[PDB]
Design a protein around this ligand. Structure first.
Ligand SMILES: [Mg+2]
Ligand SMILES: [Mg+2]
Ligand SMILES: [Mg+2]
Ligand SMILES: [Mg+2]
Ligand SMILES: [Mg+2]
Ligand SMILES: [Mg+2]
Ligand SMILES: [Mg+2]
Ligand SMILES: [Mg+2]
Ligand SMILES: [Mg+2]
Lengths: 155, 60, 80, 127, 78, 202
RNA sequence: AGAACCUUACCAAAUCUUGACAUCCUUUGACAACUCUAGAGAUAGAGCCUUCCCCUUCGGGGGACAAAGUGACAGGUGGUGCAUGGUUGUCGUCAGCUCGUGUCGUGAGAUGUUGGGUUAAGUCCCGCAACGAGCGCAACCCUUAAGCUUAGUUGCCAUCAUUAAGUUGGGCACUCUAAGUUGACUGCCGGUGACAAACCGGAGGAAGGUGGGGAUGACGUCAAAUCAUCAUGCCCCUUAUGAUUUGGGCUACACACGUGCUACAAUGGACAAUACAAAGGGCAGCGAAACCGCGAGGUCAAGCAAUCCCAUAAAGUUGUUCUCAGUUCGGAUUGUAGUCUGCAACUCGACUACAUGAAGCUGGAAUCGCUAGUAAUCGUAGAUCAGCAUGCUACGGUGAAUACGUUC
């Protein structure tokens, strides 16, 4: 949109967990319009955290997003008559929305033969490090943080 | 070779369901109607200029 | 008796409904105020062109309007 | 004193009444908690009750019709706000501070002719 | 394929049911590719095609229940 | 790319229809009946300024109304030819009750008989620009507020075709309110076919 | 927007050439409407009642159903959209395109349409040899978004009461409801753009700044497409480049590419139970209830256009179970045994249960479709139609993620 700033206006309340930031990852596991099979699986994948981890999934959950939380972006920009990359630090509204995809994309990759148990091994083993998806955020975390380049670029 | 065909069709070649339906003022054998016995382009110049009833334009 | 009226135009059938309730109410007859039954359309979506240039079409309708009027007092002043 | 709260969301009407006492909602001679079939967030149509600073004001014993199920729901959420403001007319300046009482933003729309899903276009091959 | 009389064309029946008298062999000249095989069929050929063929087909004791004189094909492949 | 014919959209809001009757089941053959007889006026009268006919049916009481503009010669000798096509059209099935004419003063303020005024000229080879331009200029000496006339197919003794619209005035085609009266006439002699279109405002 | 025959224009076999057709022509029996002969049929012939109108005072408009050989002839889905008329595709719903007076230029021409700012917009104002007009965009028109009259029988029932439920009464009438009305527009708005329109903000209509969509397609281009919808200038066919049947074909096959569908599985499959729509059609059509079938269905059979029928929507919920496999995944393929539509289902339909159960592990280079009821998911109806769609145009249900930015 060359015209500026389409409004956001999205709402996300929740029944029991009392968190806006938990009804987001119900809105990404839900494929094919079936909200009627999401929280039946999601809340049966959080009540099995305390039977697998040491604690309730609430105080593990902000840690689980906190360690997976991506820092730096590399949005390529052909500067001034050249062509190579530039590091951009993400504005804080965008970064959780970039962040939550790595739970679900690797939820469909861990061959535990039960999706409400295969997916929940990345909230366990996410507050604790070296999980499944932390490898990508450390792979791209050093993408241009160590590879610092022309950092006076606009976009 | 179609003015022979209209000479066939209003007669009867005696079996039950050998016949078919053709346009009234035109003569097409496909895409005709049964509400009008007209056909899909011959209906259109007769749906315009108001002369058939019923028909407003569109866009409900 | 519940006489029924149906017509293509929509103002014509209301002026006919007030004509029949006018010729009924000017005589002694306890007629109901005229009843709108829902008015049904039907659709004719058709190809404009003469040859095979499909995916460019337009639609037609026709809309029958259906009213309803009932009298419950057969009087000699309301016969026909 | 509250009556005749109509409620509309996506081709699914709903008419209610409000009886004083406590909060006990019910539609069509059967319960609510095991009628809204998936809908674990039954409490999140009771949420205008959350933001009107009082939960157990009135009882409803409401009616509903047509639509789907959450299309058949979520208008009760709209339908008790009209009669709720008719219970006391103060609340328009104090229920439209979270912006809740009435909006009918959207219904489905026409399949556009020679298309497939009313905004989608068919795939064209190549060049 | 239903009940009630497997639909031999009747003029073919008119030919065969009195054609079976002597020991002569003049077969069909039909080109009606519709009828099934009544079991009372004598040794004779047929002519079952009409564009251009009279293929003399054997009446030999095959599976006679087929509702077709379809031993004569219509076209080639290679 | 295509200007659709302006009578098509403009029915049902500002111009009514031509057949007021209603049917339920006979609409197939009855729709053949009116469409059978609505050529006989243009053939038998041979266009004595005949604009367009009007059908209405009232259950074995038909009524048709021909505008036709010009009285007198449409009727016959005081009432002679009118009953002659009452008798003639009464042999259709059992029909032809109460045909009546309604004359038209201000002759060239209506699209049809203008289009047969200037189709009938150039089929006798009357050098098309004086055919059109006079029928333009009689409109706005008779109070009209818009006319566009176009003649299309193979003007003169040429061998490639080109359309030469010679318009003026004010002739809108994206306002639904106005009664844009339209016509069409296809007529040509001895050197092919030819098309003629006339739009008139008011 | 329906190829079994018909369609059908193609070809092979029989088959006539004032003709299967329309017009007159001369006397008028009607039938080939039936029964029989042959043939596959067209047709070839015999039995007919070998008639009839509408009113004359032994008589004619000729209506019949068409009859006799003539001539005028007819017939062409045969050539061409570079001879055409009508009708569409498109650049593109883009915001431009042109005149009429002047006035500059020896003139081709230009101003008017340019320079300030705004807007989706040549929309808008402030300037200046220009002043105005016309076709365009905007509104006017449908559809939806909330009330009040005005109606209430099938339209809803709560206040009352028998209600399996028929909504039977009450006649209750309000609550949707179903087609006829009040009002959105930059309005009084705060800024400051300095008065320029307008732009970001706050208020209260349910309502945002053309509320959401359609219908509307400018001068014109592409010698784009159509003579096979029809019309058609001109050339050809003239006991055949016409006509009528039957019977093949349009579906054939190592192949190449478009579109569409159904799947590779465990937020998945099987299994019984188990709720909530819209839009439609149905007077020889839709068809209930209860009935006989493994089902496809068969018989009978009351009700009939908000009321009656097709007509159970389906996805999902609660619950049992298979437990990560060429697999209880999928039905591609292939014989038997049926149903229905039909004069008939072999070439050439469709559906059902009986086993058969292949290919296939989310797909290389590349390439599309979409910005909120939107893509995806399972479904509902319709025309076409005796019978036969994964296409087609319509309708609801569930319903997200994302757009800081104009560099490519
Ligand atoms: Mg902008
Ligand atoms: Mg012809
Ligand atoms: Mg009310
Ligand atoms: Mg609007
Ligand atoms: Mg709009
Ligand atoms: Mg417009
Ligand atoms: Mg020709
Ligand atoms: Mg084909
Ligand atoms: Mg049922």
């Amino acid at each position: 949109p060359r015209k500026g700033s389409v409004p956001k206006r999205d709402v996300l309340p929740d029944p029991i967990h009392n968190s806006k930031l938990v009804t987001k990852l119900i809105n990404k596991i839900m494929l094919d319009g079936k909200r009627g099979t999401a929280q039946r699986i999601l809340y049966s994948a959080f009540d099995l955290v305390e039977q697998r981890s040491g604690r309730d999934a609430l105080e593990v959950f902000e840690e689980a997003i906190n360690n997976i939380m991506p820092v730096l972006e590399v949005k390529a920009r052909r500067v001034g008559g050249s062509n190579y990359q530039v590091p951009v630090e993400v504005r804080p509204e965008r970064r959780t929305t970039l962040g939550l995809r790595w739970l679900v994309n690797y939820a469909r990759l861990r061959g535990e033969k039960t999706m409400e148990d295969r997916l929940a091994n990345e909230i366990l083993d996410a507050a604790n490090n070296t999980g499944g998806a932390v490898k990508k955020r450390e792979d791209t975390h050093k993408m241009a943080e160590a590879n610092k380049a022309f950092a006076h670029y606009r976009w | 070779a179609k003015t022979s065909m209209v000479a066939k069709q209003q007669k009867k070649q005696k079996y039950a369901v050998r016949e078919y339906t053709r346009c009234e003022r035109c003569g097409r054998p496909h895409s005709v109607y049964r509400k009008f016995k007209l056909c899909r382009i011959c209906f259109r110049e007769l749906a315009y200029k108001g002369q058939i009833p019923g028909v407003r334009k569109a866009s409900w | 008796i519940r006489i029924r009226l149906k017509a293509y135009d929509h103002r014509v059938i209301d002026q006919s409904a007030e004509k029949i309730v006018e010729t009924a109410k000017r005589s002694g007859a306890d007629v109901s105020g005229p009843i709108p039954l829902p008015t049904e359309k039907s659709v004719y979506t058709i190809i404009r062109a003469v040859h095979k240039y499909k995916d460019s079409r337009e639609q037609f309708e026709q809309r029958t309007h259906k009213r309803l009027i009932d009298i419950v007092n057969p009087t000699p002043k309301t016969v026909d | 004193v509250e009556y005749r709260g109509t409620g509309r969301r996506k081709n699914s009407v709903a008419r209610v009444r409000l009886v004083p006492g406590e909060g006990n909602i019910t539609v069509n001679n059967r319960d609510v908690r095991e009628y809204l079939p998936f809908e674990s967030l039954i409490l999140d149509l009771n949420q205008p009750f959350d933001v009107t600073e009082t939960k157990g004001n009135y009882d409803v014993l409401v009616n509903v019709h047509g639509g789907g199920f959450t299309g058949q729901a979520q208008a009760i959420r709209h339908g008790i706000a009209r009669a709720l403001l008719e219970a006391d007319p103060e609340y328009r300046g104090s229920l439209k501070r979270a912006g809740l009482l009435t909006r009918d933003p959207r219904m489905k729309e026409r399949k556009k002719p020679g298309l497939k899903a009313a905004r989608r276009s068919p795939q064209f091959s190549k060049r | 394929s239903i009940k009630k009389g497997p639909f031999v064309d009747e003029h073919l029946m008119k030919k065969v049911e009195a054609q079976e008298g002597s020991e002569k062999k003049q077969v069909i000249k039909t080109w009606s590719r519709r009828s099934t095989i009544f079991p009372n069929f004598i040794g004779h050929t047929f002519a079952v095609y009409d564009g251009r063929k009279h293929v003399p087909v054997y009446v030999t004791e095959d599976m006679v229940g087929h509702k077709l004189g379809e031993f004569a094909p219509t076209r080639t492949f290679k | 790319g295509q200007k659709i014919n302006p009578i098509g959209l403009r029915v049902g809001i500002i111009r009514d229809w031509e057949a007021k009757w209603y049917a339920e089941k006979d609409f197939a053959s009855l729709l053949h009946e009116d469409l059978k007889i609505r050529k006989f006026i243009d053939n038998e009268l041979k266009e004595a300024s005949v604009s367009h006919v009007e059908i209405e049916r009232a259950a074995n009481r038909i009524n048709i109304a021909i505008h036709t503009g010009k009285p007198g010669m449409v009727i016959g000798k005081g009432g002679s030819e009118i009953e002659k096509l009452r008798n003639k059209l009464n042999a259709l099935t059992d029909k032809k009750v109460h045909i009546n004419v309604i004359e038209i003063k201000k002759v060239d303020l209506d699209a049809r008989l203008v289009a047969e005024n200037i189709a009938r000229q150039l089929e006798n080879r009357a050098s098309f620009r004086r055919v059109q331009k006079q029928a333009i200029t009689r409109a706005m000496k008779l109070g009209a507020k818009g006319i566009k006339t176009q003649v299309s197919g193979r003007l003169g003794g040429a061998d490639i075709a080109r359309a030469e619209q010679y318009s003026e005035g004010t002739v809108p085609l994206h306002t639904l309110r106005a009664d844009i009266d339209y016509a069409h006439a296809e007529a040509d002699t001895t050197y092919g076919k030819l098309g003629v279109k006339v739009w008139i405002y008011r």
